[PDB]
Structure 1
């Protein structure tokens, strides 16, 4: 239906022209697109790419003075840039502490580590405790460093 053909291979220019042929497609939702992307990466073995390696992990941050309260934003800290960079590298930043959260980032403030540990124990699925240094040291390596050294 588009420019691409079946019996002749494709090149960069041909694919660009075929893409320009399409008009638009916005019938999907963020969850469906994320699931499709993850399935494609798993199927075609594209997880080694520099980005999209945080897609499979949901990340929560201690950017609220009180856990699960949106009226106490702590904007104006390095945690904001850390969260934003993580999301840029494909991370799914979640603003609500749901049971499906698998990663939590904690900064220099260890006051609420006990609350996080208690919530992890309560939940059926446990999320490993991580520090903001791990992502900073991992970005330059473009790979997921072991969490044993930054639990």
Structure 2
């Protein structure tokens, strides 16, 4: 493409080069988490403000009862965690699975008992985290840590 081997490319060159390349995302979301997330890892960009959940997989806590994906909570801003997760390479698994590692507790904290049922059935245990880990973290344009955002 317009990319050169002896002339350093700037933003204008990159935009023209990328525009020359056809736009097509033919890649499954796992592969963004594996290889494309490694671009922010091998070259140290995992600290980007708006896209830092690339390797962090959270729980889209939007259900009154956990392990059931039909009791979506209406009238609340609990879906922001998933979109913020979807704002990065976060594998948004709506149900408690091996992917779930950051339980972002929203307006209901009594649901922790249901989390205990699947906290042992999966290897990477999820932890009870407040809205600051997801809902306020990308609002602050960062990626909070579980220990400082517990409950």
Q: Which moved more, 1:103-112 or 1:63-72?
A: 63-72
Cα distance between partner residues in 2 of 1:26 and 1:122: 34
- The Cα shift of 1:140 comes to 5.4
Check the 8 A contact 2:100/2:126 in 1, yes or no: yes
Please list every run of 5 or more consecutive structure 2 residues that lacks an aligned counterpart in the other structure: none
- The Cα shift of 1:54 comes to 1.1
Distance change in 2, residues 1:33/1:145 (3 Å): closer
Check the 8 A contact 2:58/2:99 in 1, yes or no: no
Q: Which moved more, 1:49-58 or 1:127-136?
A: 127-136
Cα distance between partner residues in 1 of 2:6 and 2:106: 55
Distance change in 2, residues 1:84/1:148 (3 Å): same
Distance change in 2, residues 1:13/1:116 (3 Å): same
Cα distance between partner residues in 2 of 1:77 and 1:120: 25
Check the 8 A contact 1:101/1:127 in 2, yes or no: yes
Cα distance between partner residues in 2 of 1:100 and 1:81: 18
TM-score normalized with structure 1 length: 0.80
TM-score normalized with structure 2 length: 0.80
- The Cα shift of 1:50 comes to 1.2
Higher normalized helix content (fraction of residues) = 1
Q: Please show how residues 129-144 of structure 1 align to structure 2 within 5 Å.
A: 129-139=128-138, 141-144=140-143
Check the 8 A contact 2:64/2:111 in 1, yes or no: no
Check the 8 A contact 1:52/1:91 in 2, yes or no: no
Distance change in 2, residues 1:63/1:130 (3 Å): same
2:58 aligns to what SS in structure 1? strand
Please list every run of 5 or more consecutive structure 1 residues that lacks an aligned counterpart in the other structure: none
- The Cα shift of 1:103 comes to 0.9
Give the paired residue count: 150
Select the structure of larger CA radius of gyration: 1
- The Cα shift of 1:89 comes to 5.1
